[PDB]
Write a protein that binds this ligand. Sequence first.
Ligand SMILES: C[S@@+](CC[C@H](N)C(=O)[O-])C[C@H]1O[C@@H](n2cnc3c(N)ncnc32)[C@H](O)[C@@H]1O
Ligand SMILES: C[S@@+](CC[C@H](N)C(=O)[O-])C[C@H]1O[C@@H](n2cnc3c(N)ncnc32)[C@H](O)[C@@H]1O
Ligand SMILES: [Br-]
Ligand SMILES: [Br-]
Ligand SMILES: [Br-]
Lengths: 257, 265
Amino acid sequence: SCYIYWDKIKRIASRLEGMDTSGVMPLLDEIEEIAHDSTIDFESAKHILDDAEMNHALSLIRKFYVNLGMKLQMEKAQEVIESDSPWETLRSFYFYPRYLELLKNEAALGRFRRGERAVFIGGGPLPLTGILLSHVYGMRVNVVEIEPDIAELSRKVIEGLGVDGVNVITGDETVIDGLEFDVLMVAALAEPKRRVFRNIHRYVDTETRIIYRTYTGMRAILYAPVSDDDITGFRRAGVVLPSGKVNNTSVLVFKCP
Amino acid sequence: SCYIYWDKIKRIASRLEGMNYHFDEMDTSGVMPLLDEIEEIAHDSTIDFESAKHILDDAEMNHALSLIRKFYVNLGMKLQMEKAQEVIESDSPWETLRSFYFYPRYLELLKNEAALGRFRRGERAVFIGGGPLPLTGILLSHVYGMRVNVVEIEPDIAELSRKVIEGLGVDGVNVITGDETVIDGLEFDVLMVAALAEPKRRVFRNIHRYVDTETRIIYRTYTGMRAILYAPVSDDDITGFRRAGVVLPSGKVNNTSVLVFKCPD
Ligand SMILES: C[S@@+](CC[C@H](N)C(=O)[O-])C[C@H]1O[C@@H](n2cnc3c(N)ncnc32)[C@H](O)[C@@H]1O
Ligand SMILES: C[S@@+](CC[C@H](N)C(=O)[O-])C[C@H]1O[C@@H](n2cnc3c(N)ncnc32)[C@H](O)[C@@H]1O
Ligand SMILES: [Br-]
Ligand SMILES: [Br-]
Ligand SMILES: [Br-]
């Protein structure tokens, strides 16, 4: 092999090695131009990313991606809380249009209905999907967030927005033991995958629609995919591969029998 | 896991196993139901590539998968032999040709390949792995206007293939008896590798020493649940090449088609 992206990735990584949310946006663009390149097939993608010589470069890019991701969420959270026009400020979040698309295809993958009960594991500072489950899909939502200070901030976001029927529970994935719900979603950044799915397995039954977010193809450059082994005791029952600028693949699983 | 498909597949293989016990020689008419059960699993678009490998790479499935794969190649090769001899005896060769079970699939597959590899009338193609019914090289010439060499390692199979070509009055399709190393001695614009050309590792290593970095190369492989039918070409098999376009099949087409160029130096 001799893919032109091999060198391009290596070069972007050289500029992260020694390393302002606004001022690093062009780095994101460079990385996403490659991730989103639809001429790169899943075999090619895997050839680049699975290669031992690519190991360090992959880790630099992934580190950058989750860091900018988090910082953009933080910043927006606070912005939303301080805003006279919170829903307008929410709408201008860099990733907003993407999340709409994503949750739009998940709603179909998961047959979402008004009044169903959704649980969302890993809400973060800006619980946007939580918010959209209720605001758009009219579901009754519990968002779960492990870090108390982030959970506290996420409540101030929900409250600032005046969204109804979205509550934030401070805790790990085992808080699902005392909940009743129709749909369970697992955030892309919900970690650690192996423990998270072992525990989910304990507290759902075979009818619970479970949706998780992962990364497939060239988009795996952004984050480590949920493995086969991670979803032991489940079966896949539908997948949505992304297009456009949407980065996550959404997978629907059911607990085995 | 707990895919419905797992037991389906196990029962199919059980039937194959009991049948191979009774008869070495396939009864091609008699086994069509079984192909169709296998193709309904292969063609199910509800199954994603990730699950397909969950299913198909499990060590517990290896015995069943091998029996299904041996069936698919043994059936397709017998169907080819039967059709070839029919064509040769027929007073309506084209009509006979057209009734070959997989015929419509090949027209659809070749079309997508024609766009993928930008086939132009007059260009020289070489097809490795011709078989008794050299449908792909026949179409390259009759439909696509290419000047074709078909390579077939088995001399009696190459022989039968020439006779089919003649029977059909097809010009510009020559048949070489040899292995993939005959391509050193040939000029070609495009090179194509039958999904059944074996062994992959050797074939692609000989391709590598005998082509340049400009020559279009197209091979047929199996992806998703269609990999139930035959072992795919691995990324290790194509070291020293880069992928430059893939055509994922729909409908009843079995083959994925991949374009590659040899790497620089
Ligand atoms: C996943 S993101 C935000 C989620 C998603 N981007 C959204 O807001 O629509 C980051 C958060 O998930 C939380 N998290 C990761 N693993 C968790 C688990 N097992 N249980 C509860 N929260 C978790 C982290 O504290 C982090 O703030
Ligand atoms: C590949 S199939 C036929 C393909 C199909 N008949 C078509 O036209 O598209 C049959 C042949 O490939 C031949 N074959 C397998 N490996 C080969 C190789 N490395 N070189 C030349 N022939 C090969 C086998 O002997 C077998 O007859
Ligand atoms: Br820079
Ligand atoms: Br592919
Ligand atoms: Br005729």
